[PDB]
Amino acid sequence: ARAAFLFKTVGFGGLQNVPINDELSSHLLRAGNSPWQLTQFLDWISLGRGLATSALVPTAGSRYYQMSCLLSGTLQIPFRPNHRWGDIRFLRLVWSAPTLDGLVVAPPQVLAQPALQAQADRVYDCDDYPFLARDPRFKHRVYQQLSAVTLLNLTGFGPISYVRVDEDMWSGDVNQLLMNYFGHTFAEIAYTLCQASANRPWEYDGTYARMTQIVLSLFWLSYVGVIHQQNTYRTFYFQCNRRGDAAEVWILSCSLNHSAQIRPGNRSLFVMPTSPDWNMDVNLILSSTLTGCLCSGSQLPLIDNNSVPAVSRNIHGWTGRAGNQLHGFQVRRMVTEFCDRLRRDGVMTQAQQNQVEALADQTQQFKRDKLETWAREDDQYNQAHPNSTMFRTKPFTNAQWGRGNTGATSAAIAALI
Amino acid sequence: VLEVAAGRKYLQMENYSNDDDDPPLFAKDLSDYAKAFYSDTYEVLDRFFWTHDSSAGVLVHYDKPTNGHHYLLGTLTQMVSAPPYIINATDAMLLESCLEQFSANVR
Amino acid sequence: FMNIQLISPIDAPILRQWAEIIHRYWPNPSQIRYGAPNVFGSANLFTPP
Structure with a gap:
């Protein structure tokens, strides 16, 4: 169970x-004045069935980054040592109520008064704020989105996801709940x-938390290609009809053909994409969001200091002296790794692999140009x-467009099983 | 989490008359002044108090507890033996513990 | 009513007895748990869900 609640702001x-500026802030708060915009983001991405776009929000990662920037710029008002909530403004915006419920236009006096100059890469503790300390449920509800923002802002690459394999997680309630998602995406x-x-915030070792971890493990194993129709994890896998497409759809499925053999124990690691084209992949962002929602009361392992920049080192709850390595791909x-593993x-067959390669090349070209x-x-x-x-x-x-540690990451995820 | 009613600590005789020189009883002679919740871990106790009323106030001994980790919740009783003040149960126990600690510090 | 010492034990014994009974025997409020907010949510406003 998590004991320290800390978060990092964008740099x-x-x-x-x-x-961020007034135009972007207004476009974000267009339909709701609550800065916590996870549900609005979910509605905007529209189930990831197509390529979402707009004039001010070109991609889904664009909106994710803008949400992070807005929260980082706005939360610095009540976290000053004086802890006042509604006496200063940030970009013609002021908090409504001490419980941080919404943002409204500043009153005429505050508009005349100068605004606040925000800083970069600040690290804050939730328990410092009196109201957050007083109310546990409010803190736990906020800390999910705070953890998602931290997981995005920790490094300069894409968001971070957590993969864990453990056989003891499975139980009767977990099986009963998992069986209900047979045909969903x-x-x-x-x-x-x-x-x-x-x-409802989850507890440390609840059914929902265990099922979330199982689902994440299944998705990542299927993505790498260790698990497929002819090699299933307890008769469960993820199927994708068009690999390499611009908008991939993955469907949960069951098969009785074969079940793989799993070594006993508990293993885990941390994955992230490095290439910029993650901005147009809903699945990766959703996996990171699920990890963030998990981080509310689970206390995931620590991340090694040498894998993060200097400003992100020695965070009490996230980074540490000796921790797990981050694998980027x-x-x-x-x-190509997926296709090669399936072929082995x-x-x-070779023709199918060639078709997948051609489609992937076309998609990469398009995304890079845009x-x-x-x-x-x-x-x-x-x-x-x-x-x-501003930045959208x-x-x-330019260096991030080349292959990095993809082979090592694939090998590690394969060895997870 | 196990819920236990708190018994009396003092007992009055017939000649108690709320005199100036009578010893104070700190409302611990009434039927029910507080209620104890015993568990094994403070985080479990805290999670339990997410869906339970706590307007009266929750007190704790972080040092060696009587029978293990436990929280204490006060009731709506009153202490009226120290005029001209009316003191509720939570403040009464706080005052008693504070005075005991001050005497221990002196001695 | 708030200070029982004002009532004379000799002049108003019955009234003093009634006041003491009211103070030391009025029912004590309590609480109970209800509902399944996993699906239905919670509509409580001034009380814990």
Whole structure:
């Protein structure tokens, strides 16, 4: 069970302020003034059935990053040492009520008064705020989204997910609950699980937490390619009809053909994508969100200091001196690893592999071009306006477009079983 | 979590008359002043109090407890033997413990 | 009513007895648990769910 509640805010991507402005804030708060916008994000991505887009929100990762930036820029008001909640403004916005329920336009006096200058990469403790300390349920409800934001902001790459394999997790209630999702997709399962977690925080070793861990393990094993129709984990797997597509859909399935042999014990590790094209992959973001929702009362293992930048080191609840390593991968190379593993297993042919490779190459080309164009547009806007600089997507560099530790990550995930 | 009623600590005789020189009893002579909840871990106790009323106030001894980890919840009784003040049970136990600790510090 | 010492034990013995009975025998409130908020949620406002 978690004992320390700490979180990290976003850092400036070369600018001198939090990369968000009034236009983006209004577009985010267009339909609701609550800064906690997990449900709104779920509605916006529309089950990941297609490529969502907009003028100010080109991708789903764009909206995720903007939510993180808004929370980082806004939460610094009640976390000042004086702990006052409604005397200063941030971008023509003020908190309503000490319980942090919504953001409203500033009164005329506060509008005349100067705004707050936010800082970068701040680390805060939830128990410092008196109201959060007083109310446990409120703190537990907020800490899910705070943990998701922290998992996104911890490094400069994409979000982080947690994979765990343990045979003792399975039980009668877990089997009964899992059997009900026979034909649903990963997005729908994530939607229902997230809504349930929002309604009630889970306990340390509850049925919902165990089933969430099992679902994450199944999804990642299927994604790598260790588990398939002819090699199932207790007759469960994930099927994807069009691998390498722009919007992949994964469906839970059962098969009685064969069940793999699982060594006894408890194993786990931490996965993340490095290539920028994660902005258009709903499944990865949803997996990270599920891990964040889990982090409310589970106290996951520590992350090794050497895998994170200097500013993220020695966080009381997240990083440590000796911890697990972060494994990063590239989607395009992982597709090839998937195809090769299936072919060695003997359930795929060369022509099918070639077709999958061609489709993946086309998708990668398209995504790369779109991302570069959007980055250039953002740069031009920042050059034009020097007082309202912003970013619409998390900044990336040219080096991140090459394969990294994909082979090692695939080997580790395979050895997990 | 096991719930246990708290018994009396003092017992009055017939000639108690709320005199100035009578010893104070701190409302621990009434039928029910507090109620104890015993468990094994403080986080389990805290999770238990998520769905239970706590407006009266919850007190704890973090040092060696009488019979293990337990929380104490006060009732709506009153102490009226120290005029002109009316003191409820939670404040009464707080005052008694504070005075005991001060005497221990002195001696 | 709030201070029983004002009632004379000699002049109003019955009234003093009645006041003492009221103070030391009025029923004590309690609480119970109800519902399954996993599906139905919770509509409580000024009380814990």
